[model samples]
Target: ATFEIVNRCSYTVWAAASKGDAALDAGGRQLNSGESWTINVEPGTNGGKIWARTDCYFDDSGSGICKTGDCGGLLRCKRFGRPPTTLAEFSLNQYGKDYIDISNIKGFNVPMNFSPTTRGCRGVRCAADIVGQCPAKLKAPGGGCNDACTVFQTSEYCCTTGKCGPTEYSRFFKRLCPDAFSYVLDKPTTVTCPGSSNYRVTFCPT
Candidate 1:
């Protein structure tokens, strides 16, 4: 029979152990940003227990529970649950029966960008790379006209003139440059530039 692994999550899932606790050598392949994998199960005496796991930042630290630092903390096996069985009969009957869930399982590390509060800096560039012509509110435009936005220590801004002032610039940086600043978990706490507001950041199951 053939089976397909559907990654319901936004991040990539790594298929580590196959049928009968057999290790599937990743060699050097990490599932892409948001992709899936299909495997053919050869009918034979090797069909025992198919197990696998993903290496991503799970919310409950892979324990399938949601709590700060309780289960969702980092990308460790101790944090994530073992892969769900795909076989209909086996899954509905006796999955997770005799599985040995290991912590920090090697080789099956699936790199994930599942941070809800903050956008991972994988393919993202600096804030200065995008923010242009500091809005009218931010008049200072510290450094020069072509330089990137100014760095701010806090979430508040200090708009002065019409060319990217401290306050205005601060807002700009926070809005357009989250990578440089701190990650905000609550949406209401996010600071946005005047006309450039309206963004959504989501949390992952991790």
Candidate 2:
């Protein structure tokens, strides 16, 4: 139900989203640069998130793989994506406005721009090129900077404890995406939804 998925990069990007319970949290679209598509999910649904998938390949029926954000080898994204990917998270109709955020908690793969469909709601994004300065151990020879939790596996990095705190790695992500949730416990990532309006998520918003 998301991504309204505008691709701003020169390359193509396949955007995806999902929620096990919301049912409406589904859809995968391949967008050439400058193309835009919209999606609608039931309001008030929970446990939903969206993201962009890069360097992908699919068969005729749309089953395949993504080099950056792969969700169990499927294009429909019935589940969450693997790490080393940025995320756009949401929980609609709770507390007042829809709670939305661009999360770097899993580290970033693509630069993102998230804003409400209508006016009055503010916009937020992770626009920095954190990929170029990606750490050696946390990345492949020429890969994205992996999430601290994904690479280290330590409880401190994973924030396994409900009360876990942020660290240097999370701090690094914070430096780039100042408005995002840099760690599992980071809470400053939230943004408000314009009344009754859904959101628009763009990849490589440059």
Candidate 3:
């Protein structure tokens, strides 16, 4: 599987994915406005995510923090980003059923497009300025929206490893972004394509 990481936003973004032994193929990295990066995923890889970060202040060696989507404070994220960061999820080459999605259950930081390049599969999009419309109670300390789960911390919102379903809280996200999975139990939000696939994960459009 391959990923074309593009930055279409007006400003720069510290594009981060898993680094070190954690990454199936891609290592942590960054991209400037209008720039793009490409990477691969080892065959049979599944359960990986891609996302963008903003308002970050990093040291020369890429050591520092981000206002949103901070991953253990490392520029090359060793793990998944923290909440309030828009996320693109994928399951590539998995039993001939490739699953992908944009998840707002962790809250949206910016719009993202996950377009398929290898054909036979459609794309997904979510374009909401979540920061401008973030709920007062769920606003991130930095600048972003928090998932209801992060704000409420209840089993209903967080799902807490059970058969939890959608709550009014999740509907808040659902209504704003139909393409994104708004809750942990959002099974229906997933988009499946052919196992043979390539993807372009972009931040913002136009």
Candidate 4:
């Protein structure tokens, strides 16, 4: 008798069958999404059974819709009355990362969807401090630091010996540059003054 297998999922499926009690072998061809295949079977043989499987990523282990009849094992398969007509249904645990790839489902290219929040490092403080420590150059200099007068800025801040002011460049040098010999700024500096030097000139977006 001859039988036809139908794929109902949005993705492709691979079908295989075994002759006796041994493991089933691949059918050599993958059925595209919503595709079907026909095969010939002999009477009283394991030809009466066929295994249909799909690959898809699912977070829950038991979130697949099976066909009407019992296929085999823990999965449900559809049974045919005679040699020709059979519709087997099987349910697969779609859980884990890249479940579709792991299951051998054909033509399923979309990535598995999981909560990023659950898969990465946590804690607001940890994240914030780590980001804050990341290397970032200053976009513009504020009035109170040693490197204030210099147009060049970087992750490192100017020294504390400089003077403070808003408009005067020489006064800016006093607020920023302590002495010509001590004009090196190589550390992280916090804005100590609110209205005077605390203004932010440059920042990078995460």
What's the distance in Å from true for residue 124, model 4? 54
| Model 1 global lDDT (CA atoms, 0 to 1) | 0.26
Superposed Cα deviation of residue 24, candidate 2 (Å): 4.2
Q: Candidate 2: where are CA atoms >4 Å away?
A: 1-3, 20-26
What C-alpha lDDT does candidate 2 achieve relative to the native structure?
Answer: 0.77
**What does candidate 1 score on TM?**
0.24
Is candidate 1 or 2 superior in lDDT?
Answer: 2
What lDDT score belongs to each candidate, Candidate 1 first? 0.26, 0.77, 0.80, 0.25
Candidate 3 has an lDDT of 0.80
- Supply the TM-score for candidate 2: 0.91
Count clashing residue pairs in model 2: 0
Q: Considering every candidate listed, which one attains the maximal lDDT? A: 3
RMSD of 4: 28.9
Per-residue lDDT of model 3, residues 73-183, tens digit only: 878776888778888888777887788888898888878998888778788888877678777888888878889888878878878877898877677777778888888
Residue by residue across 130-188, what tens digits does model 2's lDDT show? 88777666773324778788888898888887777878888888888798888888867
For candidate 1, lDDT tens digit of each residue in 21-127?
33222211124444445444333313222222334334442323211111122222222222211111111112312111111111111211111122222221121
Q: In model 4, where is the ten-residue run with the lowest total lDDT?
A: 196-205
Models 1 onward score TM values of 0.24, 0.91, 0.92, 0.25
